[PDB]
């Protein structure tokens, strides 16, 4: 295999399908084995994982209440993958792309794996992944990613926002009636007062709850980046990693620039490896990449606001997605096929950055 980077793909159209007549690059291999279907709906399926099943005697008692909100009947299929099942399930799932599972198995320690697992599960099967310390507040068929009524309200009240490379005859709001392919919630507002490293990025999305269609290119790019970083950062890669990476950008693979074993991996390593900072980097890289190469990218922001002129200028003059587009979000926004939810949606009751209570109509999941 060759292991491309995600941070120097400005020369590649990330939405573009690569076809073959009658392979080697891990980006193309993931696309081939897990194709993206923007026309199909999000699967009505919930994924959770823990060391043990829910009826296990060691299942933590403080989680048993939370897990019932997800596992019910929901007019939605629920799957809890116990630790004994994770490896054979990923082996069955990523059989077409075995280097992905090799890397997962080589990850030192339990937190890197549990972080990485959510992206693997969603990319291969879609649905919702939510951590065990989360509570579902409103049924998922009532979410704005799912409820045809809500999606129609977004379509009927908001016109596409143009950008430098856009062609208006291609931009229509009703494309989103096929549902977003990725649904994420703000964790930290980019305009907040706190600039400690409590959160790892300026624009930060909750990693504890994510919804997606299988094959979404952002999940592809996350898996690429984490796969290549793992192999170049562990003591037993099983492959001659130095011969398989981009020769122009060697410092972008080994995690210490940002070998690791079970004893030397710290919290800021996890942060730079599988955590919410790499998630947000990949997401913004993707947003800016698709505007560069496509004339039909749908941009909907019902909150347009104080940053309007800068937003308009970033889009229409610089062809770039400004961080201000995601500031003071009170209603969902659309970037291509990514729906970004307000802080209240997956982070209610934090009494900060405008988060409302889990009683708000925008509150969908409470993080415990
Ligand atoms: C997709 O979205 C659409 C649009 O939002 C959804 O359709 C609407 O669904 C709402 C549900 O919130 C519905 O409003 C209810 O209609 C009921 C039947 O007509 C009413 O009986 C009900 O009244 C109660 O709730 C109100 C809250 O606004 C209270 O003000 C009112 O006093 C009533 O409260 C009593 O009952 C509740 C429990 O029901 C209790 O907590 C109270 O204490 C009190 O006893 C609502 O008004 C709309 O009618 C729907 N709109 C349309 C056009 O159909 C749709 O359901 C979503 N789809 C999915 C799958 O979720
Ligand atoms: C996997 O994803 C990670 C996360 O995105 C990715 O690491 C990132 O790589 C890029 C590109 O190498 C880094 O981007 C910046 O590039 C400029 C240009 O030289 C630097 O100046 C930046 O750092 C300094 O300057 C900034 C001010 O201008 C400061 O904010 C900064 O702290 C430095 O002083 C920076 O290098 C980006 O920093 C990293 N991100 C992280 C978290 O390290 C990685 O390349 C991907 N790997 C693969 C294999 O795809």
Whichever domain contains 154, its CATH number is 3.90.550
Residue whose CB lies within 8 A of the most ligand 2 atoms, among 197, 281, 285, for a mutation test: 281
Three-state SS at 135 = strand
Three-state SS at 65 = helix
Q: List ligand 2's pocket residues with C-beta within 6 A.
A: 5-7, 225, 228-229, 252-253, 258, 272, 277-278, 281
Three-state SS at 238 = coil
Q: Is the residue at 13 inside a domain?
A: no
CA distances from residue 299 to 155, 203, 216, 308, 312 in whole angstroms, order as listed: 11, 18, 18, 13, 11
Q: Is the residue at 255 inside a domain?
A: yes
Q: Is the residue at 341 inside a domain?
A: yes
Domain extent at residue 79: 26-367
Closest CA to 71 of 87, 55, 85: 55
Q: How buried is residue 57: exposed, middle or buried, by Cβ count under 10 Å (0-12/13-18/19+)?
A: exposed
Q: Is the residue at 20 inside a domain?
A: no
Give the distance (Å) from ligand 2 centre to CA of residue 45: 35
Residue 39 in contact with ligand 1 by CB distance below 6 A: no
Q: Which pair of tokens denotes residue 26?
A: 């891990």
Q: Quick one: which ligand is closest to 273's CA?
A: 2
Q: Quick one: which ligand is closest to 44's CA?
A: 1
How far does Cα 291 stand from its chain's mean position?
18
Task: Decide if 241 contacts 231 (C-beta within 8 A).
Answer: yes
Could you give the number of structural domains in the chain?
Answer: 1
Closest CA to 178 of 159, 154, 202, 206: 154
For ligand 1, atom 50, which residue shows the shortest CA distance?
149
Residue whose CB lies within 8 A of the most ligand 1 atoms, among 144, 146, 147, for a mutation test: 147
Give the distance (Å) from ligand 2 centre to CA of residue 140: 36
Residue whose CB lies within 8 A of the most ligand 2 atoms, among 3, 7, 30, for a mutation test: 7
Atom of ligand 2 nearest to the CA of 232: 49
Give the distance (Å) from ligand 2 centre to CA of residue 173: 34
Three-state SS at 1 = coil
The DSSP bridge pattern shows strands 77-82 and 45-50 to be: parallel
Give the distance (Å) from ligand 1 centre to CA of residue 143: 15
Three-state SS at 367 = strand
Residue 142 in contact with ligand 1 by CB distance below 6 A: yes
Task: Decide if 335 contacts 315 (C-beta within 8 A).
Answer: no
Give the distance (Å) from ligand 2 centre to CA of residue 33: 29
Residue whose CB lies within 8 A of the most ligand 1 atoms, among 41, 136, 138, 149, for a mutation test: 149
Q: Is the residue at 312 inside a domain?
A: yes
Q: How buried is residue 144: exposed, middle or buried, by Cβ count under 10 Å (0-12/13-18/19+)?
A: buried
CA distance 314 to 305: 15
How many other C-beta atoms can be found within 10 angstroms of the C-beta atom of residue 264? 10
Q: Quick one: which ligand is closest to 233's CA?
A: 2
Give the bridge partners for 204, in sequence order.
Answer: 188
Q: How buried is residue 231: exposed, middle or buried, by Cβ count under 10 Å (0-12/13-18/19+)?
A: buried
How far does Cα 315 stand from its chain's mean position?
23
Q: Is the residue at 47 inside a domain?
A: yes
Atom of ligand 2 nearest to the CA of 258: 43
Q: Is the residue at 2 inside a domain?
A: no
**Alpha helix locations (H) across 107-216?**
110-125, 148-157
**Alpha helix locations (H) across 15-63?**
26-33
Give the bridge partners for 226, in sequence order.
Answer: none
Q: Is the residue at 267 inside a domain?
A: yes
Closest CA to 173 of 342, 337, 345, 340: 337
CA distance 238 to 247: 19
The DSSP code for 34 is S
**Alpha helix locations (H) across the chain?**
26-33, 64-71, 83-93, 98-106, 110-125, 148-157, 217-231, 267-271, 276-293, 308-316, 343-346
Residue 169 in contact with ligand 1 by CB distance below 6 A: no
């Amino acid at each position: 295999t060759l292991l491309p980077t995600t941070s120097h793909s400005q020369d590649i159209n990330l939405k573009k399908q690569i076809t073959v007549n009658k392979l080697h690059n891990l980006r193309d291999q993931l696309s081939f084995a897990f194709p993206y279907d923007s026309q199909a709906p999000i699967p009505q399926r919930v994924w959770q994982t823990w060391k043990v099943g829910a009826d296990d005697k060691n299942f933590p008692s403080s989680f048993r209440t939370y897990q019932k909100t997800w596992s019910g009947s929901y007019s939605y299929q629920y799957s809890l993958i116990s630790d004994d099942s994770i490896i054979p399930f990923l082996e069955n799932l990523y059989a077409p792309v075995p280097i992905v599972i090799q890397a997962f198995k080589l990850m030192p320690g339990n937190i890197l794996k549990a972080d990485f697992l959510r992206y693997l599960l969603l990319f291969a099967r879609g649905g919702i992944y939510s951590d065990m310390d989360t509570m579902l507040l409103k049924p998922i068929d009532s979410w704005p990613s799912q409820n045809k009524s809500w999606l129609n309200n977004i379509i009927d009240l908001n016109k596409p926002i143009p950008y430098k490379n856009s062609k208006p005859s291609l931009l229509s709001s009703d494309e989103i009636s096929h549902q977003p392919g990725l649904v994420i919630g703000i964790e930290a507002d980019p305009d907040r007062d706190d600039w400690s490293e409590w959160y790892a990025r300026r624009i930060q999305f909750c990693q504890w709850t994510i919804q997606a269609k299988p094959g979404h290119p952002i999940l592809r790019e996350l898996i690429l980046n984490i796969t290549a970083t793992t192999l170049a950062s562990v003591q037993n890669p099983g492959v001659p990693v130095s011969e398989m990476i981009d020769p122009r950008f060697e410092e972008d693979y080994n995690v210490n620039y940002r070998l690791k074993n079970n004893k030397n991996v710290d919290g800021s390593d996890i942060m730079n490896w599988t955590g919410p900072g790499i998630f947000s980097d990949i997401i913004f890289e993707y947003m800016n990449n698709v505007l560069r190469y496509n004339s039909d990218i749908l941009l909907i922001n019902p909150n347009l606001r104080k940053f309007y002129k800068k937003i308009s200028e970033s889009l229409q003059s610089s062809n770039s997605m400004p961080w201000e587009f995601f500031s003071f979000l009170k209603e969902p926004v659309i970037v291509d096929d990514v729906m970004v939810l307000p802080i209240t949606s997956f982070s209610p009751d934090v009494g900060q950055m405008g988060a409302q209570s889990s009683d708000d109509k925008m509150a969908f999941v409470k993080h415990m």
